[PDB]
Short mmCIF file of C-alpha atoms and ligand atoms in Angstrom, two decimals:
data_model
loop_
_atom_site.label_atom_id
_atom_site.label_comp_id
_atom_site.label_asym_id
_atom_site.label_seq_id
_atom_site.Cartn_x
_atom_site.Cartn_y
_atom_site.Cartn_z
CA UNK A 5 34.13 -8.85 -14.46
CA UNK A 6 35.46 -9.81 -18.14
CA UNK A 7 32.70 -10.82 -19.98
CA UNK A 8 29.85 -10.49 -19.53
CA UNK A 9 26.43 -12.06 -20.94
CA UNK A 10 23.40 -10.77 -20.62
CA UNK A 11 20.42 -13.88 -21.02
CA UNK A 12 16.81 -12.68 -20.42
CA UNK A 13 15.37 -14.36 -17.48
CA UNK A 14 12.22 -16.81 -18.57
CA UNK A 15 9.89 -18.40 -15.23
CA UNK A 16 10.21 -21.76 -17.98
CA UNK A 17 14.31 -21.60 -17.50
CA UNK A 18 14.45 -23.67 -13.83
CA UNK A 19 18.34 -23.43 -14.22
CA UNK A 20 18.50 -19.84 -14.79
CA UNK A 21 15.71 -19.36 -12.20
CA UNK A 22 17.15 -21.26 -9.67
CA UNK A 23 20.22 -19.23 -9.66
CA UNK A 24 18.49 -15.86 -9.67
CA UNK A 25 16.48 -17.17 -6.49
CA UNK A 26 20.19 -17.91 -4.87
CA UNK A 27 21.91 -14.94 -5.71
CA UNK A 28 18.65 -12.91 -3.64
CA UNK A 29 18.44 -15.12 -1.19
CA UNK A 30 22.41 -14.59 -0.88
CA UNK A 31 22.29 -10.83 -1.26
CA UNK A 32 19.65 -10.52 1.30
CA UNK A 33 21.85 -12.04 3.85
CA UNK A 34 23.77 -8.43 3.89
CA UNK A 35 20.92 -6.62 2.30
CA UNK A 36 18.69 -3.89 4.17
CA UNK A 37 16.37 -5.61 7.00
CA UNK A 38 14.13 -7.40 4.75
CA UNK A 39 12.16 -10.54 4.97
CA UNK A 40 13.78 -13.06 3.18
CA UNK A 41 12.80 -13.50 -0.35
CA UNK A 42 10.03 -16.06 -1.26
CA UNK A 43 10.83 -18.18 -3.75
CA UNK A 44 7.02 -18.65 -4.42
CA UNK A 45 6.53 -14.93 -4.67
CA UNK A 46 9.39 -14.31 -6.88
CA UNK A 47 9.01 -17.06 -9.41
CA UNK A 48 5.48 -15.86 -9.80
CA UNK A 49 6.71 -12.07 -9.88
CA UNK A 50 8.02 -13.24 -13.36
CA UNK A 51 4.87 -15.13 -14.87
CA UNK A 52 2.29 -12.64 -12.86
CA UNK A 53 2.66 -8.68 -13.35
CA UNK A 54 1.20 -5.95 -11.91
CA UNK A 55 -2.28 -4.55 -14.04
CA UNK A 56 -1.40 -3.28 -17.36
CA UNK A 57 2.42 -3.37 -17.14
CA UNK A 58 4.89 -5.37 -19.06
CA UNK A 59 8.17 -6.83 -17.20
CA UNK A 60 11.59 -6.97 -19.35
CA UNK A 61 13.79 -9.20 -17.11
CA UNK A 62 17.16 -10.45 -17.12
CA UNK A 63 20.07 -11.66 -15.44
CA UNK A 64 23.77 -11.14 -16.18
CA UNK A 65 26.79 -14.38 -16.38
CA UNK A 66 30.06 -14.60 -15.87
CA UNK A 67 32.19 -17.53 -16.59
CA UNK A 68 28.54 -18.88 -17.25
CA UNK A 69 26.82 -18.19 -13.59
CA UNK A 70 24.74 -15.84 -13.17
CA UNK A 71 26.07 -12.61 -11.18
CA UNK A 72 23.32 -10.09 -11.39
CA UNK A 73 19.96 -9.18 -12.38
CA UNK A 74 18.50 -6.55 -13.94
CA UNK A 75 14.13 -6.13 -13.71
CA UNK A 76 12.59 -3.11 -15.50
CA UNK A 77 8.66 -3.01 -14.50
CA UNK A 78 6.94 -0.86 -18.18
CA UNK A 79 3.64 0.81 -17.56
CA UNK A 80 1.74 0.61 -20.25
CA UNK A 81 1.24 3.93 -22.13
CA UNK A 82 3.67 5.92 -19.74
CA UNK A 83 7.02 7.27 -20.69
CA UNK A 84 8.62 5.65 -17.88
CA UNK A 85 10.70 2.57 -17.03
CA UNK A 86 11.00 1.56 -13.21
CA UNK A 87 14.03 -0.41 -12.10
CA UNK A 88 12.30 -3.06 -9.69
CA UNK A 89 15.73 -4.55 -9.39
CA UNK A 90 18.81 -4.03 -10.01
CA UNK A 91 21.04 -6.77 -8.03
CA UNK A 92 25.04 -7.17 -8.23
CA UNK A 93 26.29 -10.96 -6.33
CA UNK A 94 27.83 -9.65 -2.91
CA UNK A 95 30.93 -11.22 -4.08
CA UNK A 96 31.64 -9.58 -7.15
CA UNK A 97 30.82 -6.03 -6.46
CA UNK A 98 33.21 -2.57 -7.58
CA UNK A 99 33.96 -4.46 -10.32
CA UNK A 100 31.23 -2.67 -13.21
CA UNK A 101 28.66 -5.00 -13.43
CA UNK A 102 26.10 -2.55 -11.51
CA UNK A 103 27.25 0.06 -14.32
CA UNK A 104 26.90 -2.61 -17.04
CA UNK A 105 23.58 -3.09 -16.07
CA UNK A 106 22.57 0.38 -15.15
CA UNK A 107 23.60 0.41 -19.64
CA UNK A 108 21.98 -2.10 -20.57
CA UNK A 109 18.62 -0.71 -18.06
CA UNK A 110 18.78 2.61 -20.10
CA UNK A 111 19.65 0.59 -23.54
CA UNK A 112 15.56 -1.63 -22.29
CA UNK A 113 14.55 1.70 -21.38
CA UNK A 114 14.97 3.35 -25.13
CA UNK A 115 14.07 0.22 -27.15
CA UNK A 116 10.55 0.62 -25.04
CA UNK A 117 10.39 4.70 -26.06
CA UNK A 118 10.93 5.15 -22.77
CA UNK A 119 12.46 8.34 -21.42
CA UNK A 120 12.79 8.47 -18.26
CA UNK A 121 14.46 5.55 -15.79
CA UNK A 122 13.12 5.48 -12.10
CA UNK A 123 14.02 3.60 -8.71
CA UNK A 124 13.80 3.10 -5.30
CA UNK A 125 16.64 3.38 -3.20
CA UNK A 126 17.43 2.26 0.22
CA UNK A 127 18.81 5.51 2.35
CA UNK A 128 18.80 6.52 5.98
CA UNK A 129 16.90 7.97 8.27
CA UNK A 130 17.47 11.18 10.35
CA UNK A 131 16.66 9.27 12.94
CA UNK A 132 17.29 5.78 12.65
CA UNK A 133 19.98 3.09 12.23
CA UNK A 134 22.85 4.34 9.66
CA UNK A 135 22.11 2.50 6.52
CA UNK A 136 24.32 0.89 3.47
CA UNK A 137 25.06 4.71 1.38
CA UNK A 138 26.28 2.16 -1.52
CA UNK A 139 22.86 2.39 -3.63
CA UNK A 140 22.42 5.89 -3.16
CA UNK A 141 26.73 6.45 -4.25
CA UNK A 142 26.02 4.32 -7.22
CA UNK A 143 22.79 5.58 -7.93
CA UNK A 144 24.81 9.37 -8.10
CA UNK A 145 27.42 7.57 -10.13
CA UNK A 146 25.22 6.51 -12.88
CA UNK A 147 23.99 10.05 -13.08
CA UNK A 148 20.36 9.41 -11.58
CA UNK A 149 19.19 12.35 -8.94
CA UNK A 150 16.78 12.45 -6.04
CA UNK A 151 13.07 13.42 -7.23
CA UNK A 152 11.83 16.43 -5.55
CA UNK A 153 8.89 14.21 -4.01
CA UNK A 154 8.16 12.23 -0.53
CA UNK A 155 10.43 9.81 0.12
CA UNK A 156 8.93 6.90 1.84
CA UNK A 157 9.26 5.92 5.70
CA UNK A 158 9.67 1.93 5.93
CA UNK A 159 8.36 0.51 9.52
CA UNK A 160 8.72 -2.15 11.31
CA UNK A 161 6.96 -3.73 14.13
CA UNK A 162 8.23 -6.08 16.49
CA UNK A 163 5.52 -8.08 18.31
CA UNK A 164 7.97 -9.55 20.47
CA UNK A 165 9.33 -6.09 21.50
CA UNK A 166 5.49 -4.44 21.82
CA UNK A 167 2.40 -5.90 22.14
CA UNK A 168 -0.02 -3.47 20.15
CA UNK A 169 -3.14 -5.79 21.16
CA UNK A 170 -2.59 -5.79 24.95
CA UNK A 171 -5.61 -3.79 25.52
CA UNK A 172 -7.88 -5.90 22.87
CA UNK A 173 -8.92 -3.76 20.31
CA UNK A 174 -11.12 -0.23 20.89
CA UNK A 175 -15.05 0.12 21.08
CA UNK A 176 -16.10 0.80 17.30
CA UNK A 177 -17.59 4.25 16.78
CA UNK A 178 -21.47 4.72 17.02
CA UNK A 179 -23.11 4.89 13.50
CA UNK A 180 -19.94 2.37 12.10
CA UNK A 181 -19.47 -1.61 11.70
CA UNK A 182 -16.62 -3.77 11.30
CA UNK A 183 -16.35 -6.09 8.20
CA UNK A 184 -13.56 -8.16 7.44
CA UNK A 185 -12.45 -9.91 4.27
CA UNK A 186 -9.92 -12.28 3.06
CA UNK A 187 -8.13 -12.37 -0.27
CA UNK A 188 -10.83 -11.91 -2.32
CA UNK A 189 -13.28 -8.63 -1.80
CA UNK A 190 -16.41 -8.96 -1.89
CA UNK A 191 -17.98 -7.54 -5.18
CA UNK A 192 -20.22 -5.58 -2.71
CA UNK A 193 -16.77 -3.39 -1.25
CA UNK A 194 -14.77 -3.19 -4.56
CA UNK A 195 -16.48 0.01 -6.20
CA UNK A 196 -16.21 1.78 -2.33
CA UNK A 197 -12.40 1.02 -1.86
CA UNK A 198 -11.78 1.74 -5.36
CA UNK A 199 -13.78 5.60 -4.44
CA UNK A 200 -11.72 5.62 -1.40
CA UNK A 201 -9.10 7.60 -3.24
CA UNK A 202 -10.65 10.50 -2.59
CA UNK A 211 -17.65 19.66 -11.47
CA UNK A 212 -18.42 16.92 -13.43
CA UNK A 213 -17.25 17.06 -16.43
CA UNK A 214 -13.78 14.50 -16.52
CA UNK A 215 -11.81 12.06 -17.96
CA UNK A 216 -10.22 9.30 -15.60
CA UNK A 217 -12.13 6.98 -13.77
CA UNK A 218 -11.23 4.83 -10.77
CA UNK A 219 -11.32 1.07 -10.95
CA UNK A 220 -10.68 -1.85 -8.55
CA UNK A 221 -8.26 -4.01 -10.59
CA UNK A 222 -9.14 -7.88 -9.89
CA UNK A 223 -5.79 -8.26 -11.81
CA UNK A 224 -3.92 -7.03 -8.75
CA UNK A 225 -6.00 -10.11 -6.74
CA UNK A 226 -4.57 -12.64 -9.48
CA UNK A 227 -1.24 -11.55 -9.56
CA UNK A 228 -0.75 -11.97 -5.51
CA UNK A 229 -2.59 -15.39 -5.49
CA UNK A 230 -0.11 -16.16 -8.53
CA UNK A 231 2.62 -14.91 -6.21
CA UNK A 232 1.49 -16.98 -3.63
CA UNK A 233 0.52 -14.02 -1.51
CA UNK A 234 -2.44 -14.55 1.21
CA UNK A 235 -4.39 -10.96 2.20
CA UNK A 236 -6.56 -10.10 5.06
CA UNK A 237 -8.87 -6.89 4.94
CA UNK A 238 -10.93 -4.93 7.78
CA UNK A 239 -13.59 -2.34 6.95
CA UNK A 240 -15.56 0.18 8.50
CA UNK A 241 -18.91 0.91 7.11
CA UNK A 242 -21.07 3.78 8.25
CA UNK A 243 -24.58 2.71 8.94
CA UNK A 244 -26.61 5.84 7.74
CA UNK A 245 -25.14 6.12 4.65
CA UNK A 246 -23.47 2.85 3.83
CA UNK A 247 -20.28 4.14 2.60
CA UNK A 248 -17.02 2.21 3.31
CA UNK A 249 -15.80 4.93 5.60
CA UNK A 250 -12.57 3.03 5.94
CA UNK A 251 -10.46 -0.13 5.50
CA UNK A 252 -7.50 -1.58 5.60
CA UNK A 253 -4.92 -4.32 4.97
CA UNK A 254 -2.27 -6.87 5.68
CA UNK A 255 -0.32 -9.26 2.56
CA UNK A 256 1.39 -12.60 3.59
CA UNK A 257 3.22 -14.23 1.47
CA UNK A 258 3.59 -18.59 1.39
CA UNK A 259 7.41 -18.47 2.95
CA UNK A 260 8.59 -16.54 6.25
CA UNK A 261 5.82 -17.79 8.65
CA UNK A 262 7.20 -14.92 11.02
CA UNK A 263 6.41 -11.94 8.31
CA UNK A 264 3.57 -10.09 7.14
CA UNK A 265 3.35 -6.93 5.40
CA UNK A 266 0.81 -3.82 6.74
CA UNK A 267 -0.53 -1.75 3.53
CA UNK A 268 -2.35 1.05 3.19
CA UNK A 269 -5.26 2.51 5.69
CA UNK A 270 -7.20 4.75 3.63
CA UNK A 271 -9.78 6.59 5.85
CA UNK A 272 -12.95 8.45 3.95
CA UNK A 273 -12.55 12.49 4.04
CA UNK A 274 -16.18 12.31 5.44
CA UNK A 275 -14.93 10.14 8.19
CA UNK A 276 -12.18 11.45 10.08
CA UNK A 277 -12.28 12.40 13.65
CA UNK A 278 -13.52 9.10 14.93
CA UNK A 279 -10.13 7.48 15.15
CA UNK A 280 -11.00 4.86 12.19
CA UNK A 281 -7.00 4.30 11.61
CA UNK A 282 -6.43 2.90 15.04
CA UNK A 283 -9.29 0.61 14.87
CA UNK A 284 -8.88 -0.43 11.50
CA UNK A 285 -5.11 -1.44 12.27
CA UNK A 286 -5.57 -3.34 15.10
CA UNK A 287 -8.77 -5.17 14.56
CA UNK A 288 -7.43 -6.32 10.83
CA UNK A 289 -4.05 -7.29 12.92
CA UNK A 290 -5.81 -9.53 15.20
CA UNK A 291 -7.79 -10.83 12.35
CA UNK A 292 -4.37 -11.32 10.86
CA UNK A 293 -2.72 -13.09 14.25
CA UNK A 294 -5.46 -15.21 14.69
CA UNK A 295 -4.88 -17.42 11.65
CA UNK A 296 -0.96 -16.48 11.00
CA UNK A 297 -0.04 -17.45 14.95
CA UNK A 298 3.57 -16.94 14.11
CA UNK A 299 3.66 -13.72 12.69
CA UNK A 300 5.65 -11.76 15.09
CA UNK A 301 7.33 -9.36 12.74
CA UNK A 302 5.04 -6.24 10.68
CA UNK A 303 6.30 -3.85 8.08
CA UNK A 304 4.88 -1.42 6.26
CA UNK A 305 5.91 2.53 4.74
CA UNK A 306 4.01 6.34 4.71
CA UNK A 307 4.98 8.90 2.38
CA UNK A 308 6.93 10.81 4.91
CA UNK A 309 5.10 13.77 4.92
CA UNK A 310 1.41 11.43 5.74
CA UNK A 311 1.82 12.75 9.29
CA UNK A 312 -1.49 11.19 10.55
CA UNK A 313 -1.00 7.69 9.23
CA UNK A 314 2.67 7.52 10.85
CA UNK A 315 0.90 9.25 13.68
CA UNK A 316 -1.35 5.82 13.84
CA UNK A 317 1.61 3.71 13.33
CA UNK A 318 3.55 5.01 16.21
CA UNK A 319 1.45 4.19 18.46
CA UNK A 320 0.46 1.02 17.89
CA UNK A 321 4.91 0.12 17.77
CA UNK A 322 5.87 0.90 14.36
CA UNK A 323 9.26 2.23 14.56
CA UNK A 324 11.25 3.67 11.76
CA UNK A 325 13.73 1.51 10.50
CA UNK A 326 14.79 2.80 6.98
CA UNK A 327 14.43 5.94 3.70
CA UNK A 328 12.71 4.97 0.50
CA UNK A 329 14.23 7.55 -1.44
CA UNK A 330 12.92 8.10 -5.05
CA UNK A 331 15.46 8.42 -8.30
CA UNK A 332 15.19 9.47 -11.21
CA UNK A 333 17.43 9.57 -14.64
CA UNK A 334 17.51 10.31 -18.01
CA UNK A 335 17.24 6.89 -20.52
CA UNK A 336 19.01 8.57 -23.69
CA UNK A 337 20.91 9.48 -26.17
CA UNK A 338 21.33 6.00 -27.26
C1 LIG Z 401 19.36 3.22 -9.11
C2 LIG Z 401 19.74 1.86 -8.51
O1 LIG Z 401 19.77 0.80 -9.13
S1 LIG Z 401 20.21 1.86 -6.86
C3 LIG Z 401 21.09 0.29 -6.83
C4 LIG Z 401 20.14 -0.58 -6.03
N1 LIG Z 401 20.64 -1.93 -5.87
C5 LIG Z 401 20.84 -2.41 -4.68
O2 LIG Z 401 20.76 -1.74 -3.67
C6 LIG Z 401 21.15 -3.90 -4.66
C7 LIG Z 401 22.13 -4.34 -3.58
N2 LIG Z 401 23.41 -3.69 -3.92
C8 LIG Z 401 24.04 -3.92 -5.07
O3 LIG Z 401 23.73 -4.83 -5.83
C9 LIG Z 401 25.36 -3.14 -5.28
O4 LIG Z 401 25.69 -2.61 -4.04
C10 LIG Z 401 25.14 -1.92 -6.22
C11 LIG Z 401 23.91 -1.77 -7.04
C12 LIG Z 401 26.25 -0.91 -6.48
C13 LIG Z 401 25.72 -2.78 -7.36
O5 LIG Z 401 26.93 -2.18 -7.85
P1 LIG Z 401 28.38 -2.82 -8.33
O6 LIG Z 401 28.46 -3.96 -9.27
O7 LIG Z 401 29.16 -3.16 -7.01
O8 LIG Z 401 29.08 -1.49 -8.78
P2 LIG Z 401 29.87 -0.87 -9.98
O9 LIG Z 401 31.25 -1.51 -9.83
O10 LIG Z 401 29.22 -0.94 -11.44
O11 LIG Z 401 29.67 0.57 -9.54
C14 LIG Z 401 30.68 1.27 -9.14
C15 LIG Z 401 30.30 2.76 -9.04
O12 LIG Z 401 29.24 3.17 -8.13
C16 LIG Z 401 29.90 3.73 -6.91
N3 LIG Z 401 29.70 2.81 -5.76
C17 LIG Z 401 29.19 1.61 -5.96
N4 LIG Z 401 29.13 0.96 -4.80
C18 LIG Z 401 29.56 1.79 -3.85
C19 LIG Z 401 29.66 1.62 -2.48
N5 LIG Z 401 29.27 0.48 -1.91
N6 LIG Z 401 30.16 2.63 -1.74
C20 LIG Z 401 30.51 3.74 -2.36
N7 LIG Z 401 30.44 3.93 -3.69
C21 LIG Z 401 29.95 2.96 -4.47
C22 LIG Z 401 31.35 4.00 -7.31
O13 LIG Z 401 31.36 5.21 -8.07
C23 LIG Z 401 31.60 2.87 -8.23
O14 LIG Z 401 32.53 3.19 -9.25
P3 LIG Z 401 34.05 2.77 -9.01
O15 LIG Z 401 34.49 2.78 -7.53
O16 LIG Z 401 35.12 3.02 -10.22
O17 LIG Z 401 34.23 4.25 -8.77
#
């Protein structure tokens, strides 16, 4: 743009923060179907990270307002940097601020030892609606290519188009029980979601990180959780769950339903989903609008999704590019 200055961006800074939250909430009026951006949940997403990962944020000026922002997300002890945002004012784009901070993202990236620079970008679907090709042309132009891995399938359900619940919800499985849980899980369910990723002799070790709990309630976020537990055995056969954050009344966000490999065949996903979405409806009345994304090759899960009125809206397409020389 001329020049330009590059000032880190501190939660403690209400100026600086202030404009960061306008330029989104700008941005995100032409942006890819998103909810709106919270400013709760943002301003939080600087003072609250994700378990054992440092954030190295900043924003970019120009004739002293900011223009852009740059986010790199560093996981501890890995050899990558992640790009959680990389954001160029809607009024000042082709102009090389993008590629000034795609530099200054691979300058972060090398004084961290990091390699490797990754990202999310928003692409089409065979299918559905043709999207912005922008990110994925700059993305190319900075010399990043597409990973060789599952890109993501990003949903969205319309409660005002289908009504998933208009049948209630389905007769639980013999041998099974529905729990349900709110932000906080229960001590008893932490160790049997965290094994819910699934001799002898190894070396890594699963964990449910109460960290991830503390960063969403410092984000402002609200969750709701539904499990199935089989009698016999007492193993959380399944569970599932929905985020909400303080703003957008009419949004909510659908994670992941993990089913146990002893426990398919009994159509667990279905029930889960709905009976955790009308435990969801009946204390967030105005929720109306659902997202949530598969690895497109989880056939089952987008299966589940399907039918309940998930329709595919947009490609998470995964990036990847080299941080050096220097
Ligand atoms: C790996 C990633 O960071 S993906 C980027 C993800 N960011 C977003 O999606 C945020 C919303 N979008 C944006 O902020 C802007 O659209 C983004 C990131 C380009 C920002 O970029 P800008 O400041 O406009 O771009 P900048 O001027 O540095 O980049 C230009 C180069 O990328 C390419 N390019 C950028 N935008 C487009 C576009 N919309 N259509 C086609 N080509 C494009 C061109 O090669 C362009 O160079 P130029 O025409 O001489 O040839």
């Amino acid at each position: 743009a001329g020049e330009l200055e590059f000032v880190p961006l501190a939660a403690n800074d209400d100026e600086t923060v202030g404009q960061w939250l306008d330029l989104m909430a700008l941005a995100a009026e032409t942006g890819p179907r998103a909810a709106p951006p919270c400013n709760v949940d943002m301003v939080g997403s600087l003072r609250f990270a994700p378990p054992a990962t440092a954030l190295d944020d900043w924003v970019v000026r120009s004739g002293g307002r900011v223009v852009g922002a740059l986010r790199l997300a560093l996981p501890d002890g890995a050899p990558t940097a992640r790009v959680d945002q990389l954001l160029v004012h809607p009024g000042r784009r082709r102009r090389g601020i993008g590629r000034a901070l795609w530099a200054h993202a691979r300058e972060l990236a090398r004084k961290h030892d990091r390699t490797t620079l990754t990202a999310t970008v928003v692409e089409s679907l065979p299918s559905g609606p043709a999207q912005d090709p922008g990110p994925a042309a700059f993305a190319a132009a900075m010399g990043a290519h597409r990973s060789d891995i599952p890109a993501g399938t990003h949903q969205w359900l319309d409660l005002d188009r289908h009504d998933p619940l208009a049948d209630g919800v389905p007769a639980v499985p013999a041998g099974y029980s529905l729990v349900t849980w709110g932000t906080i899980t229960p001590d008893e369910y932490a160790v049997p979601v965290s094994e819910l990723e699934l001799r002898a002799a190894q070396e890594v070790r699963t964990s449910y990180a109460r960290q991830f709990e503390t960063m969403r309630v410092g984000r402002g976020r609200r969750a709701y959780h539904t499990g199935a537990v089989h009698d016999a055995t007492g193993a959380l056969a399944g569970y599932t769950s929905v985020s909400k954050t303080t703003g957008n009344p009419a949004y909510a966000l659908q994670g992941m339903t993990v089913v146990h490999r002893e426990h398919r065949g009994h159509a667990l996903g279905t029930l889960l989903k709905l009976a955790n979405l009308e435990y969801v409806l009946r204390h967030e009345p105005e929720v109306r609008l659902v997202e949530t994304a598969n690895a497109e090759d989880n056939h089952p899960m987008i299966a589940v999704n399907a039918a309940l009125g998930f329709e595919p809206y947009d490609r998470w397409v995964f990036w990847t590019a080299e941080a050096g020389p220097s």
